[PDB]
Ligand binder design. Structure first.
Ligand SMILES: OC[C@H]1O[C@@H](O[C@H]2[C@H](O)[C@@H](O)[C@H](O)O[C@@H]2CO)[C@H](O)[C@@H](O)[C@@H]1O
Length: 406
């Protein structure tokens, strides 16, 4: 029979089992097609996918970060063009921007799932600090005042940091700055996506406001030396009062309770990111699916992508992974009325903003990760006292690099 291979990026402790649970109805209905997933770590995925495209040794299908689709699709003869092959009228319209190469009419990926980053908070810590989560995180200024109340108060048998966020180089370095830049009134690029603009006065204002939360002692400075994975685990172990995280962590914390009784899942809530002077904006990300032009089973590969876009598969994928569907009909299922999941859906719908879907963006994220993390080294006073002037110089240099890539 036809043996389809596909690469997936992990966001759970059992990536392959989860995937096989979703595709079992497809293999049942199509007995002559089998699906075998192979996990590729996030840090290695961009290089591994790029090498697969240029060399011609690839699986049939791979997951791709939504923000990388245009970079891979723009590579001569790398991907099967999907424009006209997938019925996109059933998708959440906003999810389609990252499936195309901006400015062209060429679609090289299919939207698979969506995610955003929301504000997790500890209900018990807020009660002790006199913070009302419903209202006190609503704006930048209220958020900062709430962190001041939370900072260093003893909950149970430890002093909690008010906000825990990672600072080490991973792909989330830029994502975690994005909505602060947006909320300040700035953007990474011009409307056309051909010019970097995050050294504007407003972009710098958002960068300054967020990074100086750590200067002012409201962020756990030691956590800035760690990556997203470590902060997610630390929050699940009760280390912080608040953290901005994606919805998949809810699955981790639920499993922690089942496996050892860690009750952390029972004393957290989630609210939308605080509103800045520009209005409310949120990070919109997720992943798409692509078919390698080197595939010798392109017919079956397209059948499988269409399955992943089916309502039933979209609903089941969200339940197992906690990611958000990209297909409108999936939200008819009552599972999405859950008090935590509804926050993520409302936030990405009303306020979600995705990066420009341009071929150079994937390369830009490499530079963003290496460049913007130097801001956290400035805050940590590794090499000299903190200085906003140094942050400005870092951002100017990064902007010059990104302009050259674009
Ligand atoms: O920037 C690449 C890619 O990142 C995606 O977020 C990932 C993140 O990179 C990873 O470290 C974390 O553990 O999981 C998240 C969600 O899968 C983001 O969703 C994409 O839009 C983006 O293209």
């Amino acid at each position: 029979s036809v043996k389809l291979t596909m690469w997936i990026m992990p966001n759970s402790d059992t990536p392959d089992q989860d995937l096989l649970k979703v595709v079992k109805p497809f293999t049942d209905a199509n007995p002559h097609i089998t699906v075998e997933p192979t996990v590729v770590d996030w840090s290695a995925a961009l290089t591994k996918i790029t090498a697969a495209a240029t060399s011609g040794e690839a699986p049939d299908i791979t997951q791709v970060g939504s923000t990388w689709t245009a970079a891979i699709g723009a590579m001569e003869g790398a991907l099967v063009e999907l424009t006209g092959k997938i019925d996109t009228s059933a998708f959440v319209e906003s999810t389609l921007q990252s499936a195309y190469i901006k400015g062209t009419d060429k679609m090289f990926g299919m939207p698979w799932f969506t995610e955003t980053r929301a504000l997790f908070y500890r209900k018990d810590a807020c009660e002790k600090a006199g913070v009302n989560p419903e209202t006190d995180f609503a704006t930048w200024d209220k958020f900062k005042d709430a962190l001041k109340k939370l900072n260093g108060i003893e909950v149970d048998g430890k002093k909690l940091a008010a906000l825990g966020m990672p600072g080490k180089n991973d792909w989330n370095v830029v994502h975690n700055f994005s909505w602060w830049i947006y909320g300040a009134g700035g953007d990474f690029v011009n409307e056309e996506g051909t010019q970097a603009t995050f050294s504007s006065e407003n972009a710098l204002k958002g960068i300054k406001f967020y990074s100086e939360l750590a200067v002012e002692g409201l962020m756990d400075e030691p956590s800035l030396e760690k990556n997203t994975s470590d902060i997610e685990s630390a929050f699940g172990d009760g280390a912080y009062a608040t953290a901005f995280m994606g919805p998949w962590v809810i699955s981790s914390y639920t499993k922690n309770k089942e496996e050892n009784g860690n009750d952390l899942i029972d004393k957290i809530g989630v609210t939308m990111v605080p509103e800045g002077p520009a209005g409310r904006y949120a990070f919109m990300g997720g992943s798409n699916l692509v078919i390698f032009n080197s595939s010798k089973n392109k017919d079956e590969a397209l059948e499988l992508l269409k399955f992943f876009a089916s309502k039933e598969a979209q609903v089941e994928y969200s339940k197992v992974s906690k990611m958000l569907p990209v297909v409108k009909a999936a939200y008819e299922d009552p599972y999405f009325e859950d008090s935590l999941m509804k926050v993520f859906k409302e936030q990405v719908d009303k306020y979600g903003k995705h990066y420009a879907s341009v071929p150079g963006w994937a390369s830009a994220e490499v530079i963003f990760s290496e460049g913007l993390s130097k801001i956290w080294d400035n805050v940590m006073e590794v090499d000299g006292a903190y200085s906003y002037d140094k942050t400005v110089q870092i951002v100017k240099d990064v902007e010059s690099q990104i302009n050259q890539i674009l």
